[PDB]
Amino acid sequence: QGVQKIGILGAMREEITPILELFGVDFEEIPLGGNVFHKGVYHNKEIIVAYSKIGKVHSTLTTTSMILAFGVQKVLFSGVAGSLVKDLKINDLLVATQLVQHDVDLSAFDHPLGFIPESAIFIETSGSLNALAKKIANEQHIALKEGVIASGDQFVHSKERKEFLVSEFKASAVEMEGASVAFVCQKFGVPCCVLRSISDNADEKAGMSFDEFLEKSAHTSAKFLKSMVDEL
Amino acid sequence: QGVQKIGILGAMREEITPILELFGVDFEEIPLGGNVFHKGVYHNKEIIVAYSKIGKVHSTLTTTSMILAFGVQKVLFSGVAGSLVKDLKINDLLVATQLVQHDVDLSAFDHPLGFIPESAIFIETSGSLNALAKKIANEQHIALKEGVIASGDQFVHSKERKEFLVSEFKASAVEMEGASVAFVCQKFGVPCCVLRSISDNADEKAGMSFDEFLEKSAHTSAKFLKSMVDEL
Numbered sequence: 336q337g338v339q340k341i342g343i344l345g346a347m348r349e350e351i352t353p354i355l356e357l358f359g360v361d362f363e364e365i366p367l368g369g370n371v372f373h374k375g376v377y378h379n380k381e382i383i384v385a386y387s388k389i390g391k392v393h394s395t396l397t398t399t400s401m402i403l404a405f406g407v408q409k410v411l412f413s414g415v416a417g418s419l420v421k422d423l424k425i426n427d428l429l430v431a432t433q434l435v436q437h438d439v440d441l442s443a444f445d446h447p448l449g450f451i452p453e454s455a456i457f458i459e460t461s462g463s464l465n466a467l468a469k470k471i472a473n474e475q476h477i478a479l480k481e482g483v484i485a486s487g488d489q490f491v492h493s494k495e496r497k498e499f500l501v502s503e504f505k506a507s508a509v510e511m512e513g514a515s516v517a518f519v520c521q522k523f524g525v526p527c528c529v530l531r532s533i534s535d536n537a538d539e540k541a542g543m544s545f546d547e548f549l550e551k552s553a554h555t556s557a558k559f560l561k562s563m564v565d566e567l
Numbered sequence: 568q569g570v571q572k573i574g575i576l577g578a579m580r581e582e583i584t585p586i587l588e589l590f591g592v593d594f595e596e597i598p599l600g601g602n603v604f605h606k607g608v609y610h611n612k613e614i615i616v617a618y619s620k621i622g623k624v625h626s627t628l629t630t631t632s633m634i635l636a637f638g639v640q641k642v643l644f645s646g647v648a649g650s651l652v653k654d655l656k657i658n659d660l661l662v663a664t665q666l667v668q669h670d671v672d673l674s675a676f677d678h679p680l681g682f683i684p685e686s687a688i689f690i691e692t693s694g695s696l697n698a699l700a701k702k703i704a705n706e707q708h709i710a711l712k713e714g715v716i717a718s719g720d721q722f723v724h725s726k727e728r729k730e731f732l733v734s735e736f737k738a739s740a741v742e743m744e745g746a747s748v749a750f751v752c753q754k755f756g757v758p759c760c761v762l763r764s765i766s767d768n769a770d771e772k773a774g775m776s777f778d779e780f781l782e783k784s785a786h787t788s789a790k791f792l793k794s795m796v797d798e799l
């Protein structure tokens with residue numbers, strides 16, 4: 336066969352700190368393109384862990400580097416997100432079934448919001464990996480929700496923008512990287528799963544909530560991602 | 568030494584059509600990551616030409632592929648842009664001295680607009696290449712302006728947004744790819760030059776102006792880019 340190569344991504348250092356700790360193996364640090372890639376071996380799999388830095392351009396770059404420079408065959412994203420829906424509470428886990436770039440606007444040419452020519456509004460993630468997540472969550476009695484994640488280059492902290500994301504895209508959560516990660520994976524034909532744990536409610540108090548819950552929510556997502564890797 | 572490898576990028580097919588025609592050499596078409604790369608030889612240089620598709624994620628991906636998969640040592644971008652200033656008229660050429668992602672908003676954490684932690688508001692391009700552009704333009708009696716280009720994932724078509732770009736960033740032109748291209752190049756240590764020819768005034772009539780002038784403005788930029796490659 337060959338050794339399975341798995342890319343594991345967060346956006347912030349804080350999102351990968353628990354990943355590195357939970358896997359508990361020795362990592363070689365490899366610098367490339369302004370990122371540091373942590374390369375280790377775990378259960379007949381080569382794991383490549385990195386944080387991209389915040390936002391769409393950073394995450395697009397890092398995902399592309401993982402695929403081209405490190406030859407990863409799957410990409411799993413773990414991090415935190417803002418909730419857009421009452422039933423997604425602080426610390427809850429969501430797997431993204433589709434993602435959208437919510438800040439894309441070519442409406443001057445009568446395109447729907449989120450749409451770019453030669454692409455699509457919604458980007459799909461891996462059905463087989465999302466099925467695995469649901470199977471594991473049910474076995475461990477973990478509430479795992481699934482839904483649309485909206486990604487953009489703004490930290491959302493207003494009722495008005497939240498309501499737009501729900502009305503326009505039927506999104507359940509908001510972040511700044513998932514859509515770009517999933518997009519790159521789609522372009523290269525690489526299976527992708529995007530996991531997020533809720534850190535805030537994307538409202539006027541979101542900054543304070545985020546600062547309070549980043550560590551715990553990052554750990555929650557990281558722990559679940561590790562449980563998926565254990566089944567690959 | 569080794570043969571010099573030069574990446575040449577546009578955002579739309581229409582921006583690279585004149586590039587391919589003007590170089591007038593045979594190109595091998597190579598598919599990778601949802602892009603088609605046109606690889607040819609020109610004056611002891613290997614030229615790799617592609618259009619990224621529109622926007623920040625597309626252009627980030629394609630630039631990263633050029634660098635990692637095709638080993639380019641310089642990246643020259645050619646295309647069209649909206650003017651933000653009275654002295655930049657339809658068809659005029661601008662070289663970007665710095666670029667900004669104008670739609671980035673982490674103001675909830677008291678960051679200035681355009682700023683992301685572990686990055687900067689303004690991304691620099693290559694002084695040596697920008698000096699070459701100015702030298703050539705002066706020899707050929709071509710008006711070449713220089714200034715800040717703002718990039719975002721929206722087509723700008725309003726007085727209100729234009730004025731924001733000028734007030735916030737002192738930008739001279741607006742487009743959807745330059746900042747992401749220049750950013751990737753900065754992260755990999757690859758010299759970058761971003762050239763744009765004006766297609767519209769980024770106002771309420773911008774869509775109609777763009778459709779009218781895309782071909783001519785794309786050609787103007789392409790011709791100038793070729794004149795730079797002739798001096799590399």
Ligand SMILES: Nc1ncnc2c(CN3C[C@H](CSCCCc4cn(Cc5ccccc5)nn4)[C@@H](O)C3)c[nH]c12
Nearest residue numbers: 346389415416417490491509510511537541676684685
């Ligand atoms: N309501 C919401 N809207 C949009 N996205 C989210 C997220 C998910 N993440 C989280 C992250 C948001 S931006 C965080 C910026 C944090 C920060 C950190 N520093 C200081 C600093 C600077 C450089 C290096 C290290 C720290 N200054 N600002 C960004 O990566 C997106 C969760 N809730 C969201």
Ligand SMILES: Nc1ncnc2c(CN3C[C@H](CSCCCc4cn(Cc5ccccc5)nn4)[C@@H](O)C3)c[nH]c12
Nearest residue numbers: 444452453578621647648649722723741742743769773
């Ligand atoms: N005022 C302005 N604001 C922002 N950017 C600009 C630009 C520069 N370019 C140009 C380009 C803008 S988006 C163009 C979309 C054109 C289009 C083309 N099609 C049909 C189509 C679909 C698929 C494949 C081919 C054609 N539907 N829409 C995008 O690449 C940015 C010039 N003026 C600007």
